[PDB]
Amino acid sequence: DPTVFHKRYLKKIRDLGEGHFGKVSLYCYDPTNDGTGEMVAVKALKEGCGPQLRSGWQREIEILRTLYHEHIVKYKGCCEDSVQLVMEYVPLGSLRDYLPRHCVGLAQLLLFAQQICEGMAYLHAQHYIHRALAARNVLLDNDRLVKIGDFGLAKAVPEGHEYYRVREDGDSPVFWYAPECLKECKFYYASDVWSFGVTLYELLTYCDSNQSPHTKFTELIGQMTVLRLTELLERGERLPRPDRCPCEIYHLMKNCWETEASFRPTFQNLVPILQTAQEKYQ
Ligand SMILES: Nc1n[nH]c2ccc(-c3ccc(NS(=O)(=O)c4cccc(Cl)c4)cc3)cc12
């Protein structure tokens, strides 16, 4: 019943985001057509999705129902026709849209970075890999509260496996990807840590397009792109230290980007370090 949303009570307000396969929009859900209603975010598959995209969409909805964390977008229910995913409305939107138009100090960024690590440490503990950990998928509720907002590429990791074998896709976030994902198509929990390293780089660069990983890696050059990127990352080459980033944080990022996945810190490890770093800055 509270998980049941009828189309008849859903009024589209605006668009919230769009990926290759899905679409997120803001709706007002008012069953009493008065004012005691609520704002919800409604995710739907776009027209033209393959059978494997539809079966994965069922798994995604099941995944979000399973996840309960202060730093994970709350599942609210479904809208059945095809199926639409109903979630809570996280008002300030994504950090990719938020940061270039806002004033957020270093201590606040480090708080966001710590909360991402908290939700991510819970995700891994629930035996799931995210695979799309970037600033566009982290949502801001208020100046003190972030939520991992999209699980489109999330996957369960079987019984005693430390990695998940992935399929070659031209749609995948290549510049957020660890070398083991690009060369061997292997996604470990450690591969998400690498993406967190890239996410932290994005926050410290205010999600400025001119300083983006895409632009910096293009400059660093001097599937052919993926091939040259793997050599770059194996040579030991990394993203530059952002002007604003203190050396201890750049170290944290570099540890997150250790070439060998086993050597990278765990999300459970990152939470205290970041809490300290955030506490130190003010
Ligand atoms: N403001 C919000 N309240 N609740 C939400 C749930 C998801 C989202 C959301 C989450 C992720 C994105 N990033 S995105 O790159 O646009 C994207 C990637 C994959 C699939 C979709 Cl539909 C969108 C954009 C919006 C926003 C809100």
Residue numbers in the entry: 884 to 964, 969 to 1109, 1114 to 1173
Quote the paper.
Compound 1 (IC50 6 nM against human Tyk2) was one of the few inhibitors that co-crystallized with mouse Tyk2, allowing us to determine the structure of the mouse Tyk2 kinase domain. A critical step was to introduce the ligand (Compound 1) at low protein concentrations, to prevent precipitation, and subsequently to co-concentrate the Tyk2/Compound 1 complex to a level useful for crystallization trials. The 3-aminoindazole core serves as a canonical hinge binder, forming three hydrogen bonding interactions with hinge residues Glu972 and Val974. The inhibitor’s central phenyl group linker positions the sulfonamide chlorophenyl group under the glycine rich loop. The placement of this moiety is guided by the sulfonamide linkage’s stabilizing interactions with the NH backbone of Glu898 in the glycine-rich loop, and conserved residues Asn1021 and Arg1020. An overlay shows that Compound 1 induces a ~4 Å upward shift in the loop, resulting in a more open active site conformation. In the mouse Tyk2 structures, complexed to either Compound 1 or Compound 2, the steric bulk of the sulfonamide chlorophenyl moiety occupies substantial hydrophobic space under the glycine-rich loop and would potentially disrupt the His/Asp “glycine-rich loop lock,” thereby creating a larger active site pocket. The ability of Compound 1 to enable robust Tyk2 crystallization may be related, as inhibitor-induced decreased flexibility may favorably affect entropic loss during crystal nucleation and growth.
